């Protein structure tokens, strides 16, 4: 897995077309989404990754809290980014990853949104420009 | 070399601190830029891009160029980015590869900007949603 991690002023999205033929289900109220002073986690499941959701998802649940803590941010997007791999895990791996990254997080304690899987997303991001507000993280099993 | 091209509605970003001790030196005026209908090319240049400086900046020239051409994009975006490597080249190269990329963009006919480089920098952005809004490049020797 790779990880981009932003500290955002704002971070709000807005679905547009399919990506997947059949992508994840969604309700109107997923269409949209906003947050404020929130670390936005953009997440690539890689091919790699299927070899050991739980333990990949873990360090991910982990490495994401720390920058969260030292930030102090107590909002957390977790959105599905491919263009962070070009070794891409297949949907249902993806899927299972990011989903428990997103329990995961809620466990620890913070306010996490998520973006839906398998779209094109358009979005509007305020990143803030502190030391710590672009962090890249790389997760292996 | 790793790209990262996102079609935007809007690009502007604001000069913070600095990250190197020596950074691009800048005038007033460029410590803050703003473009509309813009390519943005985030760029990372690469440990191993110091073996070809004037090949990889050719290509990433193309590169591009090509999306630009595709989603008719006439402005273009310029900005160092190290959060696409783990393997990221000297301060002289990455700015020497910046530069020709710049410059060669310009030769193509795009109107184009760059933020400077050796900064933390805040940042607004509007990421179209259509399918090649946002797209990954590997450029190698």
Sequence with gaps: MRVLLIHADYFEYEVKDKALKNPEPISEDMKRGRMEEVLVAFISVE???EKNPEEVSLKAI???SKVAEQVKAENVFVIPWAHLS???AKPSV???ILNRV???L???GFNVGKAPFGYYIAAKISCKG???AE???TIVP
């Design 47 to 49: 091919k790699v990754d």
């Design 62 to 64: 982990e490495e994401i």
């Design 86 to 88: 070009s070794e891409l």
């Design 94 to 96: 993806a899927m299972d």
């Design 102 to 104: 997103y329990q995961g």
């Design 106 to 108: 809620k466990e620890r």
């Design 130 to 132: 502190h030391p710590l």
């Design 135 to 137: 962090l890249s993280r």
